[PDB]
Each structure stands twice: as C-alpha cells, then as structure tokens.
C-alpha cells in the first residue's frame, strides 16, 4: 500500500538529514517513523539541519519533556507561517501515523518542494503543478512519453531515464530503457541518479513498478532530481 511506501520514503529522507546535523549527538538514524520521532529530538534536529538555525531543546526522559520537544518544533514551524491544519503535541507524542507522514509531508513541502519555479509557468498553478511541468519539459521530445501525474507515468521507469538522460546522455541508453523491464529501468535510474548526480535513493524499484505508485513519495524523489538539475 501506498502508506507503508510513504512512512518508507519518508524515513530515508528524514535520515539523509539527521546525519547531516552540524552537533555528533544529534547525528541519529530512525528505525520506525512512529516511534523515533516520538520524544521531539529528531524532529528538532531535523528542522535545525534544513533551516540551519540553533533551536532550544529539553534533555531529560520524562513524558511532558517529549510534549515540549513537539511543541518546540510545531512552534518553529508556525512561527514561519506553516498551517498546521490542527495538529497537537499529542498526537507526535503518542506516534500517530497520519498526522505523524503528515508532519513529515508538511515539512518536505516546505523545505523542499515550495521553491520549484519554472518560467512562463501560471501564477495560480500549485507547487506539485510547477513540478510536473518541469518534468514535462524534461521530457518534451523523447518519443511519446508523457508526463501527466505523478503516480502512473512514472511506472515504467522510462520517465526517470530520460530525465536523467539531459546531462547524463552518456550514461543512459534509452534504446535499452524501452527493452528493458520496469524493475531493471527503476533500479538503473536510482543507480545513475545516486553515482552521477548525487540524489541520494529514496525509493526502490518495487516501491514504484505497482498498479499505482504513491503520489508523495514520487514527488519527494522527483523533487530532488529538480534540486539536482532545474
């Protein structure tokens, strides 16, 4: 289903920054979503990394000490206007999976995904519109691939090839993309992506080669090939 793929995308995105943070013991790994992000620290952590601001923090154990770490991190974010639709300590407290990938959506939104600006786009397109056109563009001329949305299109892998074939046209064959299985063209893309262009793998392949791929987690990894080359 497309939620356990989502905690998963999420996960490693998560992680790829924790273990940037700037201070070793903040440097963490999560194992389960909902559970490690339970007590605030990592979701402090993460917001010091991605913003590079310095955030207060509770040390003890104690379970009002996890409340004031969710409230810490909630505050900052509202703090830069983020709606949080309705979201208590609580429900981060006590590991709620929709509102815990939806705190996580929220933050990848708008570290992430909120600066895609492509030219003689419409103003009232959303972030997730600007995305697509962007991909769209990547892929004007291969030979009758569309990109629609961010689920089915990109299936097949041929989607992910072919942008990574518009500085990488040495290291990928599109002969051999439109031979190839949906697995073998998954992999290879996330393989080059990683080695070539520095986006780090959050997806895998059986994640994506499904009836229907998770629409966030798609746009999360595609996210970062924008970041990668716009």
Known sequence: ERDRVQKKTFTKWVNKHLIKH????????????YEDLRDGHNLISLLEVLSGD?????????????????????????????????????????????????????????????????????????????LLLWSQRMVEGYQGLRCDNFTTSWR????????????????????????????????????????????TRLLDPEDVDVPQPDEKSIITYVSSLYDAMP
């Open 54 to 130: 310095s955030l207060p923090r509770e040390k003890g154990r104690m379970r009002f000490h996890k409340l004031q770490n969710v409230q810490i991190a909630l505050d900052y974010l509202r703090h830069r206007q983020v709606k949080l639709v309705n979201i208590r300590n609580d429900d981060i407290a006590d590991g709620n999976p929709k509102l815990t990938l939806g705190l996580i959506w929220t933050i990848i939104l708008h570290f992430q995904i909120s600066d895609i600006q492509v030219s003689g786009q419409s103003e009232d397109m959303t972030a997730k519109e600007k």
């Open 22 to 33: 700037w201070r070793a013991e903040a440097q963490r790994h999560i194992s389960d979503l």
């Open 156 to 199: 097949d892998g041929r989607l992910f090839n072919a942008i990574i074939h518009r500085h990488k046209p040495m290291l990928i064959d599109m002969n051999k993309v439109y031979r190839q299985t949906n697995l073998e063209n998954l992999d290879q893309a996330f393989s080059v992506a990683e080695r070539d262009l520095g986006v």
